[PDB]
Design a protein around this ligand. Sequence first.
Ligand SMILES: O=C(c1cc(-c2[nH]ncc2-c2cc(Cl)cc(Cl)c2)c[nH]1)N1CCOCC1
Length: 332
Amino acid sequence: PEMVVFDVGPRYTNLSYIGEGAYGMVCSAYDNVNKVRVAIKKISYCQRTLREIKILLRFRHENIIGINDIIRAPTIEQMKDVYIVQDLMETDLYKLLKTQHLSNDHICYFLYQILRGLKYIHSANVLHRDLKPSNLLLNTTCDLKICDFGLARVADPDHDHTGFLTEYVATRWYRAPEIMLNSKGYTKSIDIWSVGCILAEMLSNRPIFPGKHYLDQLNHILGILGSPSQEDLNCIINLKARNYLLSLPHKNKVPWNRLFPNADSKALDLLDKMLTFNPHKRIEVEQALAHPYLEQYYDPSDEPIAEAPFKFPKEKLKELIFEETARFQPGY
Ligand SMILES: O=C(c1cc(-c2[nH]ncc2-c2cc(Cl)cc(Cl)c2)c[nH]1)N1CCOCC1
């Protein structure tokens, strides 16, 4: 067994540590069949693993990461670790933004691919719910792939309401304001907010709303968008959430061109539509693709949608992971 314990059999060799994923270790390895280096995640936090495997195996899209192979023991009794193989990417948007200034051409291309991938995700009635720069992979030619479906769910807008200050799992800085107020994040509008945050981050190389805690996140958002309007407050029926907003001092809107003085005016018009406080008035993925900022790339005949809507104890969980990974077994 290969050590870094990463027994990926004889096919994958010359292992190098990349970092640490949620359920385990990520390494690069040399694929001896395809004669290229690949990424491998070792999975040794259980439910998220099965959900993501199911989604990634079902989806087939240029801007969504795919699973090349899955390594595991031939029997349920012997199965301990599960290894997921993917193409080795050059970097991610998080690492790129830490050291590289993006040209308007790069921002435009990255945004287009994010939305193209998101169109397909949403067409499958799925919400990613954790879009952020570290979940956007890039190769040496800037082709972008969305990864990490660990928090993804089937859209359920009829069961989206909840009380004020409901605990949320997704990365704080990319959370839409309704999550802190009255939303479970069961609607498509939640992903568009995260894309809007990513666009603002590509424009200045810094997160636009770096909240330090749950409620600080909301005050960061309102410090730029300004106090919500009466109309936008009327949409919030939950009295505790609406009264919290009414208790705050008036905050002025910070004009986008003041925050981003070197940004393209069309990029700011699209940003404004994505970072709309009211989720019902927030732009949808297909309108965002049709926005004049992305006119060079927009081609709905080359922006595929999914063929069908996607639909979903410890012993049963292990058995389901065994069953979902059976297609990669060498006995076929
Ligand atoms: O190729 C990867 C890469 C890392 C990951 C990764 N990070 N966290 C988890 C995983 C991951 C890897 C694989 Cl191979 C499968 C799954 Cl499900 C998840 C995926 N691809 N990278 C990381 C960013 O810069 C260098 C290139």
